[PDB]
Design a binder for this molecule. Structure first.
Ligand SMILES: CC1(C)CC(=O)C(SC[C@H](NC(=O)CC[C@H](N)C(=O)O)C(=O)NCC(=O)O)C(=O)C1
Ligand SMILES: CC1(C)CC(=O)C(SC[C@H](NC(=O)CC[C@H](N)C(=O)O)C(=O)NCC(=O)O)C(=O)C1
Lengths: 218, 223
């Protein structure tokens, strides 16, 4: 049966999966779960994913509850022989390493920041604190890009898809003007056909944040 | 070339790799990085890992900066065809899925709690808040173990090694009395020879945390 993606396109890790679906032309059935209404706490979704998180993928009997597992799974089933998830071990480990960096460091810090706005109101967030945490992520990715057109090497991989959606979200608040490699990479990413799938949810997140946080992004 | 593991055994994700190294009898050179003295900010280590995090593995010219990639890399190179990182696609996806649960949810929440203690002192931490966050993680893992007999399936996998080190760290603070499957599973993990690689760093974490946080964990909590 075709895969099913439970999703809220405001979420960075959802948008990474939407970009891969568009890049690989995967026929998928989308099911919207409204996180700001708490629809992730509906009893049947919680039964499916007790982490109450999106993206969640149901593909046959397989239930994946993390965008990085979904990215890898979809590339393995639908892009065998592709370069997005390279077959050579050392290259695949480098892509895996950067996907985990996205989860563990970039997304963690952006999520901490944005959740603080949601839950405290923008005016009550220590923006300087989060600016330092997130500028440090920028600095790290700028080094990752030294002598490398893309995050994990010379070609576009799953790591770029994961990182670009969160990066574009950080960039709602903090500009890339100080990071030339990272700003050129982001411009290049924005020229992908598949980047179209990031646009709609990023703007929806911008609008939802500004409403719930009682503020406007620079 | 022999793998080099930059490590602080107090760190849960370090201990998961140490468990795999002992379980597979991998010869690895250990290089200590004292997180509580800020040695992860020495210029040479930042050059190697700009996230200034342990575990960091150097194996040949491959540099891995996340425990879950290290676990997968070491299983592929030293447990080829094994069942820790299974070859069947759906089974491997389930292990990967739970490795990411440990990264995204359990460790995130345990790290947030313990970092708050380090930065604020235990008496200034909203312990009730973190108790809610972490008990929710217990509930989730109990549900996983209601469906299977290990975290990602019927056999031991990398997911159990990743999850048990953080589980044991959470359980320094919060008891497992109300969680029978998780107690049964935890007791089974404690029977593995490889669990020795978790016991020592866990105790050092307990002692350092009590010093820095000016508190004591409830001795009755730990299983
Ligand atoms: C305010 C903001 C930006 C806060 C967020 O964190 C997100 S992302 C939505 C979130 N999804 C995950 O946390 C999955 C992370 C995994 N590592 C992965 O799939 O990669 C989510 O579902 N939250 C719902 C909840 O926790 O109840 C966001 O969209 C809004
Ligand atoms: C107080 C406590 C428990 C806080 C912690 O978070 C840790 S773990 C040490 C930490 N390592 C990582 O964050 C790696 C996470 C990756 N997803 C992975 O490898 O799996 C670390 O190195 N911190 C140093 C720093 O950030 O400066 C801990 O040990 C202490």
């Amino acid at each position: 049966p075709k895969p099913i993606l439970y999703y809220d396109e405001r979420s960075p890790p959802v948008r990474s999966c939407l970009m891969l679906i568009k890049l690989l032309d995967i026929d998928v059935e989308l099911r919207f779960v409204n996180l700001f209404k708490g629809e992730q706490f509906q009893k049947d979704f919680l039964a499916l994913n007790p982490q109450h998180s999106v993206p969640t993928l149901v593909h046959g009997d397989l239930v994946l509850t993390d965008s990085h597992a979904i990215l890898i799974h979809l590339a393995e089933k639908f892009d065998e022989g592709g370069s997005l998830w390279p077959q050579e071990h050392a290259e695949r480990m480098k892509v895996l390493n950067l996907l985990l960096f996205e989860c563990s460091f970039l997304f963690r810090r952006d999520s901490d920041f944005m959740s603080a706005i949601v839950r405290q109101g923008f005016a009550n967030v220590d923006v300087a604190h989060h600016e330092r945490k997130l500028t440090e992520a920028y600095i790290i990715m700028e080094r990752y890009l030294e002598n490398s057109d893309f995050m994990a090497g010379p070609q576009l991989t799953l790591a770029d898809l994961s990182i670009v959606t969160t990066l574009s979200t950080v960039n709602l608040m903090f500009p890339l003007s100080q990071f030339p490699r990272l700003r050129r990479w982001f411009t290049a990413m924005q020229q992908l056909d598949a980047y179209e799938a990031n646009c709609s949810g990023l703007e929806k997140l911008r609008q939802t944040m500004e409403s719930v946080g009682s503020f406007q992004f620079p």
